[PDB]
Scaffold this active site. Structure first.
Site, mmCIF file in Angstrom:
data_model
loop_
_atom_site.group_PDB
_atom_site.id
_atom_site.type_symbol
_atom_site.label_atom_id
_atom_site.label_comp_id
_atom_site.label_asym_id
_atom_site.label_seq_id
_atom_site.Cartn_x
_atom_site.Cartn_y
_atom_site.Cartn_z
ATOM 1 C CE1 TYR A 170 -85.131 35.547 90.313
ATOM 2 C CE2 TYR A 170 -84.105 37.140 88.834
ATOM 3 C CZ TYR A 170 -84.011 36.254 89.895
ATOM 4 O OH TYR A 170 -82.794 36.081 90.524
ATOM 5 C CD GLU A 192 -85.003 32.406 91.619
ATOM 6 O OE1 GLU A 192 -84.645 32.530 92.803
ATOM 7 O OE2 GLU A 192 -84.199 32.363 90.668
ATOM 8 C CG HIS A 213 -78.295 31.319 97.213
ATOM 9 N ND1 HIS A 213 -78.630 30.527 96.135
ATOM 10 C CD2 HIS A 213 -79.005 32.465 97.072
ATOM 11 C CE1 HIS A 213 -79.497 31.170 95.373
ATOM 12 N NE2 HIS A 213 -79.740 32.348 95.918
ATOM 13 C CG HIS A 233 -80.015 32.895 87.923
ATOM 14 N ND1 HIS A 233 -80.882 32.826 88.992
ATOM 15 C CD2 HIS A 233 -80.313 34.045 87.271
ATOM 16 C CE1 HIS A 233 -81.669 33.887 88.988
ATOM 17 N NE2 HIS A 233 -81.343 34.642 87.955
ATOM 18 C CG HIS A 293 -82.810 31.814 97.642
ATOM 19 N ND1 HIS A 293 -82.989 30.716 96.827
ATOM 20 C CD2 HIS A 293 -82.694 32.881 96.814
ATOM 21 C CE1 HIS A 293 -82.979 31.101 95.563
ATOM 22 N NE2 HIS A 293 -82.802 32.409 95.527
ATOM 23 C CG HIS A 324 -85.893 36.968 94.051
ATOM 24 N ND1 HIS A 324 -84.684 37.467 93.614
ATOM 25 C CD2 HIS A 324 -85.680 35.656 94.323
ATOM 26 C CE1 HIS A 324 -83.783 36.501 93.618
ATOM 27 N NE2 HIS A 324 -84.362 35.392 94.044
HETATM 28 C C1 LIG Z 1 -78.839 40.184 91.665
HETATM 29 C C2 LIG Z 1 -79.280 39.361 90.443
HETATM 30 O O1 LIG Z 1 -79.994 39.860 89.594
HETATM 31 C C3 LIG Z 1 -78.733 37.703 90.274
HETATM 32 C C4 LIG Z 1 -79.128 36.756 91.129
HETATM 33 C C5 LIG Z 1 -78.569 35.114 90.960
HETATM 34 C C6 LIG Z 1 -79.192 34.040 91.480
HETATM 35 O O2 LIG Z 1 -78.685 32.725 91.302
HETATM 36 C C7 LIG Z 1 -80.621 34.056 92.388
HETATM 37 O O3 LIG Z 1 -81.212 35.072 92.674
HETATM 38 O O4 LIG Z 1 -81.103 32.787 92.827
HETATM 39 FE FE LIG Z 2 -83.022 33.615 93.684
#
Ligand SMILES: CC(=O)/C=C/C=C(/O)C(=O)O
Ligand SMILES: [Fe+3]
Ligand SMILES: CC(=O)/C=C/C=C(/O)C(=O)O
Ligand SMILES: CC(=O)/C=C/C=C(/O)C(=O)O
Ligand SMILES: [Fe+3]
Ligand SMILES: [Fe+3]
Ligand SMILES: [Fe+3]
Lengths: 288, 296, 288, 297
Positions: free
Chosen positions: C256, C266, C200, C247, C153, C215
């Site tokens: 990241y 990522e 997602h 996360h 993604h 990313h």
């Molecule tokens: C906007 C931010 O920093 C958090 C992102 C959460 C996630 O699971 C991803 O990016 O896969």
């Molecule tokens: Fe991500």
């Protein structure tokens, strides 16, 4: 402090076909070749070990183990153990330095089980391919073939395990970590001995024919590495004995497979952390 | 064989609130409470260890560590070490048996770094809660809280590390596995000591203030366990210092967090397998960051 | 059945130096290069994907994302989607087949947040290098650099996320899997959208600037592969943003890091299994 | 978008002893009990799923599977599928809503292989035991017994797998992900079907006896969870079929074990990510003959 006998140092095994043995140990198991002598034996070491070799193969008409050696703390310790082995009633033989590439002299003797054991204090440190300053956790070698971490131990099949235990616990400074009981006739059908804080540095199973090698063991990093090892075995057409699984004794998650010549080896990981002051764990024959 | 000083035996730490300390260490970290004496100290140990205790907390005005003890092979060894310590120039104190619940007499002495160290030969063996005959691989205890496997080591902050090293290596049979060098005009800013074939049983970092405790460490089975520990910490709103990561110095994959009284603890796993015949590994001061956190 | 929009198809990112970009992506992240066009773009695909490309690099004077495309079920679906987008009020552009190597025509449009999105039904399938008959466990590609499994993604930053959500759910067939509520504004600060049963396929976070890229993400097989990715990053002196962790949203375990040009990528794995009939999870802003 | 048939919804299996069956499924496998109806059936769901049930046990004289059902997108889709199933030539029977606890009406039909398949659009959502606001990644449920995450699929044994394939791909919206070729009189001796981007939602192996259940499968979070599952089985004296091992016809790392009634189930993790546009992978019969799903074994 780790003193006296420190760890398994080397295993010399017989292969029915050299060139083929070299291929399998270099590409499948992923041992690092460090040398080849005049006798034609080829030396290997696990990547993360630092000494010149831990596994040596010799072309012969019979598969099996020639001998298994242990590294001891120092020269003084080697001389003492020699005298102790003799005081105990065992006849020792002294192999000269150089007889084995990058290896000092060794004290050899035969166990009642028929197996040949060696003790040595010196072997050239070649390093693990990683710098000694600001060292990385690993490099490309870690992913070349199965690529085990260290020669962990070996399990030997022999006739007089009872007296074998005595030699190791009373002369070599080992202690019983685990054992298997006989059918109530209570005689350890098998023993797991340690000379460190590992579950076992060597093991013996009571068997009629002396000098038999059940397997040499190589240590892996994680359960996922055991899984990867299985995929590499499958992709290389390796004859697997007993697939990946949890082992009752020592809590090891392992795989048993045979090399081309029919020598059984193990790639595993896991196990608790015993110390000299711990009482051994036992297993009833029916479980074994 | 393993002789002389075998391994970390116990760490007695000071907590601000004894009650929350019990809850946290029993329910969050997953230590097995094994006793409470008359002085108001509660005894814990890792489920897989066999001795009565490895961690002991005590309510005091301030957080920190009172002392860190090592179990030695035998009494003859205990008496022997005590002799060498004195002959070395260190004054030793003899704490009688029973002073600590289910514990034998200990040989206590203070280090140049200000930390109190003990040596003992006897600690009652209670087992790991699993049968001695046909034992299961593990039990319910293994999943009660983080549930570490053993008190692995501790890192101390104090002055005169050079002198501390000499004591551990020249008297207690330890040996240097890794060190973090000071800037130019070399000396060691950090040292990791082993009295076995573990990467380190204890470590010291050069610090002006003495008697300081950076952290006590607990060993985990795998990298996934480290992530599980992270989740458990979050679920209990435990303050985490440095999230799950890789060290470099030791290769240890770990996480640092704080107990309710501000005492830092660690849950990690991994590392190579050094032996006394090995030469130490060195880290340059300039490359210190990577040594502390490898990935970053 | 998976219909409509199937999955993320490709991300074309701008790099300040094509050379450093080629080396980084091909040898550090371990993507497989599949081509280069007369326009100076390099094409990559994850080793275990089957289509010709999922990540394209173009040397420009500023880092960031040019566009992000999604592969749809078939041509009829592509036409259908094009018609619905315009009927919704959006203006569409049709990019011919071949403008991109091994790719068919694409439907492009800009979102209120300023990002360019594409839809395409055809892209040459080149396979994963393993045979379609009795496929060996895995090949060496598996361990070439980080070696992710698929473009998982991307996370885009821009304004009008509320309008963006409607387009994806009402027009494109996605559904909200997770959301981050804004501080008592009753308007989500972030949305995680799926067009399948993955946590997602794309996500957006409210941000003043338009068309910004947070990313592009790549999937790994296990938590240990994540640790390995971090090790590899350190070894190649890659600049890491957030160390290996989990996360809250998605439950994904990730890392990241930035490529040579400053583009964040990522490497993660994990997450539950949502379906279109599930209600979205929500995270209070104060618990971001 | 995921449309038409979404995923395996439930499997009703027969157990020789309802009591020991409840203890095994709630304590060993670690499924969550969600109810027990008048008929004497006990319902379970994996902890991480969100619907009321995915596994139902029924005390009976023989072990095996009663039926396997899939959840579809919505009511409109259920109606459409029913029409297409009949249009195709199959006879369908509508099971009333409530006949199963918390379950809407279902479209049932029999396959040429003898197995009964159901389709339904509604089933009460009970959650996964975790808050819907600021949700944690897991809780105690994840560590109760093996604790699988979802009813992944099942593998059925029966004749006319060719006709079953046609029904699933031409009417139900599934597609072939993998197959096992016949010795040489080429056809397919086995098929792995998907209605999503999973390796498979259901599989069939050509077998003479109709309605045979090889196994129902449960998904685990990681390789270590599989190892763990192995330990829990050994501890509960569970009869293990084939220990932890790398599959092949799915790249899965799994363990096959038995119910106390003799119902085989699977606890695995792993696999790639196929999509509708992909061509199937193939396995030679001789390869299949050495695998875990071979009739002999
Ligand atoms: C906007 C931010 O920093 C958090 C992102 C959460 C996630 O699971 C991803 O990016 O896969
Ligand atoms: Fe991500
Ligand atoms: C007779 C036999 O193979 C037992 C071996 C015991 C172990 O702990 C191991 O292999 O790691
Ligand atoms: C940077 C620093 O203080 C050392 C970190 C490494 C360790 O192994 C530890 O703390 O046990
Ligand atoms: Fe072994
Ligand atoms: Fe530490
Ligand atoms: Fe299956």
């Amino acid at each position: 402090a780790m003193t006296g006998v420190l760890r398994p140092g080397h295993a010399q095994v017989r292969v029915l076909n050299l060139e083929e043995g070299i291929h399998f140990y270099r590409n499948v198991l992923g041992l690092v070749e460090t040398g080849r002598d005049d006798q034609g034996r080829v030396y290997f070491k696990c990547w993360d070990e630092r000494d010149h070799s831990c596994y040596i193969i010799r072309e012969a008409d019979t598969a099996g183990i020639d001998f298994f050696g242990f590294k001891v703390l120092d020269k003084a310790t080697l001389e003492k153990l020699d005298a102790d082995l003799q005081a105990y009633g065992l006849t020792t033989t002294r192999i000269p330095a150089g007889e084995m590439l990058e290896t000092g002299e060794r004290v050899r003797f035969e166990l009642p089980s028929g197996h040949l054991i060696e003790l040595y204090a010196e072997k050239t440190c070649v390093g693990n391919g990683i710098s000694e300053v600001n060292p990385a956790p690993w490099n490309a070698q870690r992913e070349h073939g199965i690529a085990p971490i260290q020669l962990d131990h070996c399990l030997l099949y022999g006739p007089n395990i009872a007296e074998v235990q005595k030699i190791f616990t009373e002369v070599l400074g080992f202690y019983l970590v685990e054992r298997v009981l006989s059918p109530d006739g209570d005689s350890d059908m098998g023993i797991w001995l340690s000379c460190s804080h590992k579950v076992h540095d060597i093991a013996f199973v009571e068997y009629p024919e002396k000098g038999k090698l059940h397997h040499c063991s190589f240590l892996l990093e994680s359960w996922e590495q055991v899984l990867r090892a299985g995929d590499i075995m499958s992709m290389n057409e390796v004859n697997v004995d007993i697939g990946p699984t949890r082992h009752g004794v020592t809590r090891g998650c392992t795989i048993y497979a045979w090399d081309p010549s029919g020598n059984r080896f193990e790639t595993f990981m896991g196990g608790y952390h015993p110390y000299p002051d711990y009482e051994p764990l036992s297993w009833t024959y029916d479980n074994f």
